[PDB]
Design a protein around this motif. Sequence first.
Motif: not given
Lengths: 193, 541, 81, 49, 421, 161, 54
Positions: C16-30
Amino acid sequence: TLQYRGQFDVVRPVVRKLVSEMRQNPIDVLYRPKDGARPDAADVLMGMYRTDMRHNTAKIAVNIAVREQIEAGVGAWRLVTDYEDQSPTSNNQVIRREPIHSACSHVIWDSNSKLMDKSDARHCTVIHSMSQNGWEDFAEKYDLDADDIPSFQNPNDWVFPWLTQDTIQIAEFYEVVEKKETAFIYQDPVTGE
Amino acid sequence: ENRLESILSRFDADWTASDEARREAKNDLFFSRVSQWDDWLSQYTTLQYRGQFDVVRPVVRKLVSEMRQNPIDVLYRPKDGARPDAADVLMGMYRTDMRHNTAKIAVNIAVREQIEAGVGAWRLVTDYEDQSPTSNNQVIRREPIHSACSHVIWDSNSKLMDKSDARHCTVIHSMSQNGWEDFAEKYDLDADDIPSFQNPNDWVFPWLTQDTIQIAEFYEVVEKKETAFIYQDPVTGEPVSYFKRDIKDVIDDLADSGFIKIAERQIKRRRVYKSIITCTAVLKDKQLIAGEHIPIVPVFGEWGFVEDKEVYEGVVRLTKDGQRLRNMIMSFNADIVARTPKKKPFFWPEQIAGFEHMYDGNDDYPYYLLNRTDENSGDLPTQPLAYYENPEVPQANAYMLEAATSAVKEVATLGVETYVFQDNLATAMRRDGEIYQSIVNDIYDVPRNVTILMAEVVDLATGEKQVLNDIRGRYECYTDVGPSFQSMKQQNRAEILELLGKTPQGTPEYQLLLLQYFTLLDGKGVEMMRDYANKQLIQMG
Amino acid sequence: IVARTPKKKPFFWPEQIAGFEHMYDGNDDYPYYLLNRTDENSGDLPTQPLAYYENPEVPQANAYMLEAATSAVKEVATLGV
Amino acid sequence: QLIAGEHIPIVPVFGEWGFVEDKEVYEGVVRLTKDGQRLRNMIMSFNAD
Amino acid sequence: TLAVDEIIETISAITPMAQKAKKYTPPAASMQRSSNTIWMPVEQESPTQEGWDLTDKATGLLELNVAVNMGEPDNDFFQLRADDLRDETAYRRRIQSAARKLANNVELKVANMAAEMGSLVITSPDAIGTNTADAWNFVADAEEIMFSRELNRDMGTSYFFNPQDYKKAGYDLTKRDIFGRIPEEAYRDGTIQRQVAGFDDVLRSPKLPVLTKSTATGITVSGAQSFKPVAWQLDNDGNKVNVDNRFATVTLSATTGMKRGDKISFAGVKFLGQMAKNVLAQDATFSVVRVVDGTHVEITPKPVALDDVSLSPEQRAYANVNTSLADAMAVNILNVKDARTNVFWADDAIRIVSQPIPANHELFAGMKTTSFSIPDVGLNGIFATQGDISTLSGLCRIALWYGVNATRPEAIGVGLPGQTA
Amino acid sequence: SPTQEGWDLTDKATGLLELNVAVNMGEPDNDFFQLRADDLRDETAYRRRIQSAARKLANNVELKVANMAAEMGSLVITSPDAIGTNTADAWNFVADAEEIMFSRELNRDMGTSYFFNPQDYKKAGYDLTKRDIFGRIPEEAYRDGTIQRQVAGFDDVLRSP
Amino acid sequence: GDKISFAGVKFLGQMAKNVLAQDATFSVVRVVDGTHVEITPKPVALDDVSLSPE
């Protein structure tokens, strides 16, 4: 096992309140003349009691007894006599009061006693436990041979989390004998007999 | 057999027998003064949020202020059958040499440490003062002891709250390099030989450590019968003076001045000796010091014996678990707020392919557009929009935060009030008064009041040194506890005011008002009022 | 219960999140989170609402018995009246 | 340079004062509140964002 | 699994020699720039002529000296893993054990230095417990050889037995078939006495070395050698460098089987009276402190000979041997069998130089340092703690810097029972 | 603890090792007996059986202590002859024990004890009495059999049956 | 309860690690096999090369 164990105490505040409440109301002895005796019969005895009971040891012993009474159920203290040469109460002697810690296991009373104050006890043993230096002091004070370390039924238990526990024990056995002894009726060279 | 061997054996016995209580008291002091995150291995285990949301310190502050608002001081009263003014001079001396700042500072330090850890102490020392002596070119002053729990090691075979029956006591001194140099200069020791002793802080809390030098002072009390010479006073009566006090100094000066020996008795008394020691040798062996008691006064909070082991406790020991839980839970919740993804929509890239500037956060558009078709499936699959859930505090975290705070609130209640702590402080002050009385009898010049004035009898030796002559009729006043006064005039003013507050408006009330005016300080107008009161009192006979 | 219990985090299949993992890191950059949509073998990803690990809770039994025990001690620790 | 008096001419005033382990520590009214204040500032900043 | 809190006490060491030896702490900046060495003068001995006219016979002045230095720190560097119950516990018992171990190491170095640099050698052909009062005879032999050489015993003397020979002496005392006060004490307690045969301190030391036998045989002096006392000598640059007085390097035929610590005695040389220069009947004993080369050794008493012709009178005033080595003197080895040593000395012959490690300085920020007090001995070192988050392990170190010196090897001694074959 | 020398000690740190010993209990020591109601009209035998049971339990404890001490004891001092022949053999025996314990640098702060069996105690008393002199120790060993309460540095020397 | 001693193994100082003159003596507490026994002092060698410094 390695598991959490926390003490969220709720009985210690109650014990503290009770101890403070019973400390706020100090109590002592009061000697009163008997029926038909002189009005000032108890003045001398009362004055001597106050004199040799005004010290810190008496107050501390009573406080210790009170706290152990609130917590465990029984406390105690002791009355002893000593030869004092600087400030004696009378006849170059003083009568003082000493504490007893953990009386429930250090003061063993006569089993055939059915009174709260133990006035029908004919004997009582007090178990004095201490360390090497205390034993040397005790022996040199009561004229014993300090080489022979004494032993007695150890009133304490092996507390695992404690590094060191003392190992010297001895017992003091008081016994009371009621008997008819001779009394001499002299005649006073001043007046009376 | 060696003196150092015996001393070190006694100290090691006491040090091991007071091991658990001292460590718990040090834990209490560190918890209530430095930090509540008292773990030391977690100093290098990757940084995580560790907050300090304290709820016990206000209770300590409240209790300390309550104990500060009611000062307690020694109060000497005449014994039963003694002359009615048998304590005025001793009270004057005590006030004179205890009105300074060091006395109050030592008492306040001991009281704060008693409240927090459970045990504190202070020391009574004597010094040679020249400019403003109290008596016989000397002063008796009081000094503080910080961290008394780990610094004053009492005789293990002592079962009294004030350690009256302790036969010895070792106090550990820690000082900087300049402090050790001055100490060596004061006691005539050797400054090159840096001393050493067991570290008072042991090795718990290996941080909070300073380059300090340790030495020890070992006091011991010896009770023995010594010779006392009974002279005949050339004025009146017969005084008794100890042979150890005029052994060589004035043993013939007494006769030369006119004291005739009457008898010779053996009288039991206690003598106190101080030793300066390290872990390897004794620097001062058995230096006799003034008094009949060890000069250290301890203050305790909750005190007792469990099984031949002395336990003392302040107000901080029980609250520690609840407070630690509260700090931990607040830290976890702070982590929840900080490191957690926020609420944003879940999108497929093809759902907003080309419209991605509409969702960046700006407010330049009246609506949001979505792609509807796909070149393979014909129409994009329809799925309701989902949002990342908002961060929440777990019900367990909230419940246990409330429960920990409530538990600390329940347990951090001393008494109902500090009556027991104040009574223990009063006991400590009674012991202080006892020790001070003995030292005064030993070094000060205590006049004897005859009913025929004060009669100070003293004589000097051939070395120009003056030896005090105190009779054996010295314990004429007993110790008590009373309000703290700076001077005898202040005490008298307070007494007159107290009497005035209960006497109704009559002839005694007039007399007490005139007396209170008489006992006033001096300016100009109060000078006029006091002169008026003096003349009225004199005239009224 | 408070200390050792997994917290509320989403359940994801890796694809589901393969390739988008850094989005769910915890940061608020997206501005949002993206997900994978298609599969080369299953055509499209199966549809099911996302699940989250439940928050820790103190059981009603624990709460009730803590209150009952505290009240019991408070009642029985009344020396006299 | 010899100056007048017997005492060092500096008078110190303390708040909460003591020794922990041969180390002097003092505190005012602000030291304990810093963690809560910083947390509140951070949370309000997050909410403003 | 987890353990209770009561420590099973298993060992107990005593450090009598280190306790007894004096401690010296010279100034730190001076030592730093002086390379951790400092020189002390030796008591001046004066020559003396007899006659009326002494034209061109005026002597000069000479004043020899010795040097004391320091070695390397003795550490207890150890590690503390973060997540370990075994490391969280016992990291204070480790500190206590480190203190005891450091004191033990100090005492061991003192004993080894005394044994391997003691010049005066007393030997016996049989064990102590063979004949009657043989232990007393041993102690008395030590005292007599110290008295005949007129050494300075002003600040005390000491004799250290090993446990076996202490038991032999006690056995010799108790087997007397009599009981007064000395036999009664040696029977009740094991102690022979505190003063014996003249020494004012006679102890039993548990860690005296074993002086293994020397396999050297058939060694002879190679060439006549004369040793001359000097206070300084000029180097290649013309700078006058001080010369140490308690060493002398001598060339033999072949130094095979020799090591640091063997006791030798050349055949022909004899002790003197030091102060009066009266020839003794006891052969001069030396101790080899270094084996350099295959034909050189360093012996600790410098054999200044009385009959030397090349010595000026102010140098001859320092003579301690009746004659000089003469190119054929057979050198006898006195330790011909393994035996644990007894050690006697004058109390001012061994000292312990000590220096601080100024790690409290601001340059050493990040690590926390305390003064560490090793027991029994009067020595202070540092206790430092640091920690690197890279390995998540606190590092704890205990350091203490000292150097044991034998300033007067002619006063230190070695007793060697049972040196037969 | 170990030790190491030098200034530079990088990658030369050591871990910590703390060891344990285990202490446990064993079989309870019992005394049973069954009596009928008619056999308790006197009760003297019942009371005496209780007393003798107490005494025998104490003796069993002492037997177990002696056996365990004699069965797990690492230090062994053996002599090739009886403890009666040649002078001061008993003292040499006790002092050999003291010497091994001292040279091993073991911990003896709590005291030390030596226990003789009665035969060896008698032999040691003989060793004292045949000494051809009666100062004080021979006189005590002649009047009573006691060697002494302390020999060759041992705090307490006793005889054990 | 039998007492044994291995030929060539000597005691140590146990603090200074100096070789004693007397053979190490052990006391067997259990015979578990026909080839295995159990002795009460552990023989921890000083010159062993597989032993960590601690």
